[PDB]
């Protein structure tokens, strides 16, 4: 069937005297063939317009400052990860035993190994603080 040959930004029209037609406003077709253009996603409420919607691409969504896009195609706005945890695929998860993040918008990096530098573990570390070393 001819509709296979419709390029992105068009949809296969049933109207005769035309195989395809260009996507209506506020609707996109990122692949060729589609019998219908999909409605452009709105970046409103708790979202913000990163990229605009073209007849060939959806609008890409962005998050407020102090927040980050969480989820497939930014289907969430998670708040920037607090001290003592790192941002993972499945949102904001706490640091593992033996690692720490002592800041906001940070990443869990392992505790200092005091012995490695001929030192001893004066104070142990938490999920939010590093091991304080002492002499051996």
């Amino acid at each position, epitope marked *: 069937d001819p509709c296979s040959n419709c390029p992105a930004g068009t949809f296969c029209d049933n109207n005769r005297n035309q195989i395809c037609s260009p996507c209506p406003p506020n609707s996109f077709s990122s692949a060729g063939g589609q019998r219908t253009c999909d*409605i452009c996603r709105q970046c*409103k*409420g*708790v979202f913000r317009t990163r990229k605009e919607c073209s007849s060939t691409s959806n609008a890409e969504c962005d998050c407020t400052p102090g927040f980050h896009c969480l*989820g*497939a*195609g930014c*289907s*969430m*706005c998670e708040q920037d990860c607090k001290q003592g945890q790192e941002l993972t695929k499945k949102g904001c998860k706490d640091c593992s035993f033996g690692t720490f993040n002592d800041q906001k918008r940070g990443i869990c990096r392992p505790w200092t190994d005091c012995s490695l530098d001929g030192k001893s573990v004066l104070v142990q570390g938490t999920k939010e603080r590093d091991v304080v070393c002492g002499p051996g």
Partner: antibody
Amino acid sequence: VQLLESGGGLVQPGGSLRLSCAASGFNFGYSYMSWVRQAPGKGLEWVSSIGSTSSHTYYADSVKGRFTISRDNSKNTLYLQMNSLRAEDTAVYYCARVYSSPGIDYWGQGTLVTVSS
Amino acid sequence: SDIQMTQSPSSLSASVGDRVTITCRASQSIGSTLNWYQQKPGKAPKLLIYGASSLQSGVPSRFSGSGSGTDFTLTISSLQPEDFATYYCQQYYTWVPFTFGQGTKLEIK
């Protein structure tokens, strides 16, 4: 966190009401406020929304040019000026808040708007 | 004109202790921009699931949201007495307007 709807009641078609929602226990200023109605027996239909910015007023097709959403972030109050009220408008109206999650987390108890066909 | 949410089934009889599976179908791919609500008669709705999968604070782990694209399912394991209500699925893909499902009523035998 609380949301208290008022101003609903029984009106003749063509008439008007002013709904009010009283917020407390959160930052009203930084909340995307909405009205969602539910006619008796039926489900939930979005009515209107207003951004934290208070410059963006959005409306459902059926209430465009009749209803008007407004907010007074000083008195932490949301309003719905419902004019030219039709029979189809008979419903319980709820004020609903989106804070940081994309889902509506806090709803009010509702206020009943009734039209006498 | 706009995005159509279609829940399946309209009504569902189930006995306590079971696991339930409500469907919600979006008229087009909407990624994971889906919410789940529970409404008990006379009371206002309550947010269960936001972003198709994550739970709101307070909701028990027996309620689990899944799906991406068109087909989404709310699953309630170990049906509990207080879990008998009408459930609604909402989309926030479009904010003007956000659209809800017709609702699925969960009942007893």
